[PDB]
Design a protein around this ligand. Structure first.
Ligand SMILES: O=C(C[C@@H](C(F)F)n1ccc(F)n1)N1CCC(O)(Cn2cnc3c(cnn3-c3ccc(F)cc3)c2=O)CC1
Length: 337
C-alpha cells in the first residue's frame, strides 16, 4: 500500500523521519490545510512538506525530497552531520506550526507533540523550594548502563543531590544542601523519544556510537513518571515507529519500521523499498548487542490512537493544492518529452 522515498545518502535520518511524520495522520491532514497558495514554489518549507506528503499518498513511484531540502537550507554534506534528528523535526514542525497560525488548524503541533514537565530544587534543611514548568516536544533518554525504557525513565526522574562543590544557592537562606529533579505533568498524544546512542568522547575528542542492548516494549505504561495520574486517561503508550541505524557513522544505513494504522501489522521503509515485516523484526531485532539498532521511537497514547491515526482521504486535500502539484507534474513531464 505504501511508497518509499528516493535514496539520498547524505541526508542520513531524514527519510525515516518524513515517513514517521507522514503516518501521523492527524498532522498530515493539518499540513494539507495550510494556506500555501501564495507561497514561493522553491522557498516554502510548508509547501515542500505538503508536496512530499501528497506524493507519498498518491505516487506509485518513489518520492523525491530535493525541493524540501532546498527549502530548509540543509544542502551540504555536513548539514545533516552537524544536527541531531530531533533538530530536523523542530525545523520542520516549527515552520508548519507557524504557517498554521491564524488558521482553523492553529495549535495542531502543540496539541499532538507537546508535554509539560516540572523541574525543581528542594533544599533539605530549610523551607525553600523552586518549581519551574517547561514544555517539551521530545525526550532524550539515556541508554548507557540501562537495560530498558523503564530504566531510562527511572533515571530521567531520579533525584540528583547538590552539596559540597555542587551546592545550590538559595538567596535569602544561604548556599544550601539540596535535591534536583524532574517530573512529568503531562505526556502528549504522540511521544517522540530519542535514545542517546551518539555520545561525545574526551579520551578521543569525537562522538562515538554506543551499540549496547536496549529493550523497548510494544506497550509502554508511563503512569509511574507523572506527578499526578488520571484514572480516566491512564498514560498507556503504543509503539508506532522505530527509527533504526546500522554501523558506526553518518555513512551507515538508516531505516524505519512502522505499523502505520496502529494495529501491530508492521512494515520496513528502507528508502525506496517498502516491505512487510514481522513484529519481531521491528522491535526485538533492533535492541542491539550481539551494530543495527534503534536511536528514536515514536509512541502514541492509547486513548488518542483513533484520532491521531484517523483515515485521510483525498477529500481531505484542498483542490487548490491538488491542482498546483498536478500542474508541476504536467510541466516536468513536458520538459521531459
Ligand atoms: O544519525 C545520527 C548519527 C549517527 C552516527 F552513527 F554517525 N547515529 C546513528 C545512531 C546514532 F545514535 N547516531 N544521529 C541522529 C540520531 C541522533 O540525533 C540521536 N541522538 C539524539 N540526541 C542525542 C543523542 C545523544 N545525545 N543527545 C542529546 C542529548 C541531550 C540534548 F539536549 C541534545 C542531544 C543522540 O544519540 C544521534 C545522531
Amino acid at each position: 500500500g505504501y511508497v518509499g522515498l528516493k535514496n539520498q545518502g547524505a541526508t542520513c535520518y531524514m527519510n525515516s523521519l518524513l515517513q514517521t511524520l507522514f503516518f501521523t495522520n492527524q498532522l498530515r491532514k493539518a499540513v494539507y490545510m495550510m494556506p500555501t497558495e501564495g507561497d514561493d514554489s522553491s522557498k516554502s518549507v510548508p509547501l515542500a512538506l505538503q508536496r512530499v506528503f501528497y506524493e507519498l499518498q498518491h505516487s506509485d513511484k518513489p518520492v523525491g525530497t530535493k525541493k524540501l531540502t532546498k527549502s530548509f537550507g540543509w544542502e551540504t554534506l555536513d548539514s545533516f552531520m552537524q544536527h541531531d534528528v530531533q533538530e530536523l523535526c523542530r525545523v520542520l514542525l516549527d515552520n508548519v506550526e507557524n504557517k498554521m497560525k491564524g488558521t482553523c488548524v492553529e495549535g495542531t503541533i502543540p496539541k499532538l507533540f507537546r508535554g509539560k514537565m516540572v523541574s525543581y530544587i528542594q533544599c533539605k534543611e530549610v523551607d525553600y523550594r523552586s518549581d519551574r514548568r517547561e514544555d517539551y516536544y521530545d525526550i532524550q533518554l539515556s541508554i548507557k548502563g540501562k537495560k530498558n525504557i523503564f530504566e531510562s525513565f527511572v533515571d530521567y526522574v531520579a533525584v540528583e543531590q547538590l552539596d559540597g562543590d555542587n551546592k545550590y544557592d538559595a538567596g535569602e537562606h544561604g548556599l544550601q544542601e539540596a535535591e534536583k529533579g524532574v517530573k512529568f505533568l503531562t505526556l502528549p498524544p504522540v511521544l517522540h523519544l530519542q535514545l542517546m546512542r551518539f555520545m561525545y568522547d574526551p579520551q578521543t575528542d569525537q562522538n562515538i556510537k554506543i551499540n549496547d542492548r536496549f529493550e523497548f516494549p510494544e506497550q509502554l505504561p508511563l503512569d509511574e513518571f507523572l506527578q499526578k495520574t488520571d484514572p480516566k486517561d491512564p498514560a498507556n503508550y503504543i509503539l508506532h515507529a522505530v527509527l533504526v541505524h546500522s554501523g558506526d557513522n553518518h555513512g551507515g544505513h538508516y531505516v524505519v519500521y512502522l505499523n502505520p494504522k496502529g494495529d501491530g501489522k508492521w512494515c520496513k521503509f528502507d528508502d525506496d523499498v517498502v516491505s512487510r515485516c514481522t513484529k519481531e523484526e521491528a522491535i526485538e531485532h533492533n535492541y542491539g548487542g550481539h551494530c543495527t539498532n534503534a536511536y528514536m521511537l515514536v509512541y502514541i497514547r492509547e486513548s488518542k490512537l483513533s484520532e491521531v491515526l484517523q483515515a485521510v482521504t483525498d477529500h481531505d486535500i484542498p483542490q487548490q493544492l491538488v491542482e498546483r502539484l498536478q500542474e508541476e507534474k504536467r510541466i516536468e513531464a513536458q520538459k521531459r518529452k
